[PDB]
Design a protein around this ligand. Structure first.
Ligand code: ATP
Ligand code: ATP
Ligand code: MG
Ligand code: MG
Ligand code: MG
Ligand code: MG
Ligand code: RB
Ligand code: RB
Ligand code: RB
Ligand code: RB
Lengths: 324, 326
């Protein structure tokens, strides 16, 4: 017996992306699954109102304020598909912990750390994982960037490249920080890699995960931005990535190491940079996208794990951890 | 007084009884009308008069209302989570309060989860240049790899009140200590034991500009500062200020405020240090320190000119000034 509750939408800027991910999950999940939608105002939509909001691909306003009058006892596993702030950062996970329900994905600590680009880089750099030079900037404080431009300026909690700017001159740093501070109280300034190759590898499992084949994203835009990520045809995924044999194994080893160190459960898509033959871990995404242009399902599809089997194992991993 | 505070104490962690002792200390001095909500050891909540009854018993094995409780959250301006350990101090209750939209006392989700994990907090501190004791993380069902020699200190990675902590003298005793630590967490840490060692503690108060209390020192006769020594009245010697030369005390306060900002803590924290052979080591950071009659945090700020009711009042104000800042 297995009935899954899928939660999508959310208040983060990735609201629309989350509903697209729900479309992909509902299409392939092998269990009976009900949808609950968190509207952009924080109020919940249940039942047919959730499926109606899914068809509209956007839910500006909801019905039930948090916590929702949801019949939690009717479900055996909860699948949070809320990308970004207040969904991927441990907040919703904390609610599901007190609720006692098994849930898909990383716990509170792993979700919060992987969503903070500054904190995650601190842990990974200390563990010996190569990362791009970076600094954190708090809103209202003067930035101090001890390396030469170009820069990449990001909200610390961002997803889908929202609020990210490529900064070529010092005079454009203030405008990029102001854009980033619209989405977070803390920003990161990273040294831009130019040129750069972008590699991605999926991980499946609890703490000790298994790695998918390594995929490489190619595009013609200035960088892998929001339009390039979710417009069909803009991004190509080369799988397996054209890498020298030792490099593919190194990417997979670094991903599983970061996965274990951070204590991630369920799943993660680990992104990498390849510049001048050197590897850098970009970030970990504990709730990767499942949109028609998303890469996580395609990484494991090339690894022999079909889309329904991938979702089956995610739900299965949630119960395995719940039973210790 | 129109301000109304909701105090949450108890919890499912092994520090359940310690949390109830902290609740009695906070309720005794808080200058606002405060209601108590008790999380029983089975996870269900006790409200109203039943919560005060469990407070007198100093233990609540069984509760009445399953989570989420039928609590009138709109009646309270600030929520004070006084839950030590897992499912209270590690960001879980903070995430629930974030979704409720209520201002709450203490660190946010990320800082609470990071500071409760003794392995991940040490990584961030070591990356920032803060001195820490050499250690290694050991996960459940995985053979230990310790690149240093005993004596060891084996702890659950998310423990409080010295629960599940063992002092290991011989390498043959390591498996028994890890088996004890794995009763409370899937991850454990193996730290190099410092002997002899002096234990220094300092409280921090604030959101953006944290201010440090005077440095205090804990002395005892037990093999280590364990659960019985921490909460049995008179068993621990609490020295405030610490009998150190002023230079070392200033270095302790500087490291505490540095770690407070590095780990992104908000509201309050008690920073524990080790002093061995003239070298300072940051032990851990506690975002919800005890308010037990034998606890250091309220005493540290009392010696700093911040009385017990004034300390609690500033905690509530800091919760409001952060929420307004968004
Ligand atoms: N240091 C850097 N050097 C070069 N390019 C970068 C750098 N940082 C970011 N980029 C570009 O910006 C894009 C987005 O960066 P990042 O992966 O941090 O954003 P994100 O919002 O977390 O993405 P996702 O949608 O995968 O969550 C990257 O795919 C890359 O193309
Ligand atoms: N590396 C070490 N060297 C010497 N003594 C240690 C070491 N680690 C722990 N101890 C002893 O064990 C006690 C508890 O350690 P620790 O502070 O990690 O436990 P805790 O559960 O976090 O305590 P708290 O109640 O402050 O949360 C310390 O007060 C100290 O006396
Ligand atoms: Mg990301
Ligand atoms: Mg990315
Ligand atoms: Mg502690
Ligand atoms: Mg301590
Ligand atoms: Rb992330
Ligand atoms: Rb840095
Ligand atoms: Rb702690
Ligand atoms: Rb280490």
């Amino acid at each position: 017996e297995m009935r899954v509750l899928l939660i999508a939408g959310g208040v983060s800027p990735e609201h629309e992306v989350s509903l697209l991910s729900a479309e992909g999950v509902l299409r392939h999940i092998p269990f009976p699954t009900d949808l609950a939608v968190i509207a952009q105002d924080g109020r919940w939509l249940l039942g047919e109102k959730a499926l109606t909001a899914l068809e509209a691909k956007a839910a500006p306003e909801g019905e039930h304020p948090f916590p929702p009058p949801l019949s939690w006892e009717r479900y055996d596993v909860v699948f949070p598909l809320l990308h970004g702030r207040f969904g991927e950062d441990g907040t919703v996970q904390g609610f599901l912990e007190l609720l006692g329900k098994p849930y898909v994905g990383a716990g509170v600590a792993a979700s919060a750390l992987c969503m903070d680009k500054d904190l995650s880089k601190r842990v990974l750099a200390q563990a010996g994982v190569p990362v791009v030079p970076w600094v954190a900037v708090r809103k209202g404080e003067p930035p101090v960037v001890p390396f030469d431009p170009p820069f990449f300026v990001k909200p610390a909690n961002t997803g889908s490249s929202v609020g990210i700017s490529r900064v070529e001159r010092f005079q454009d740093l203030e405008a990029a920080l102001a854009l980033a501070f619209r989405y977070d109280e803390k920003a990161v300034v990273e040294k831009a890699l130019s040129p750069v190759r972008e590699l991605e590898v999926g991980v499946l499992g609890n703490v000790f995960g298994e790695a998918s084949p390594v995929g490489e994203v190619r595009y013609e835009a200035p960088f892998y931005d929001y339009e390039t990520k979710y417009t069909p045809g803009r991004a190509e995924l080369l799988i397996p990535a054209p890498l020298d044999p030792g490099t593919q194994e190194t990417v997979q080893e670094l991903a599983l190491k970061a996965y274990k160190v951070l204590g991630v459960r369920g799943m993660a898509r680990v992104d990498f940079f390849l510049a001048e033959g050197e590897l850098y871990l970009n970030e970990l995404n504990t709730i990767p996208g499942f949109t028609p242009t998303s890469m996580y399902p395609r990484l494991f599809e090339a690894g022999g794990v079909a889309y329904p089997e991938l979702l089956r194992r995610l739900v299965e991993l949630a119960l395995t951890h719940h039973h210790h």
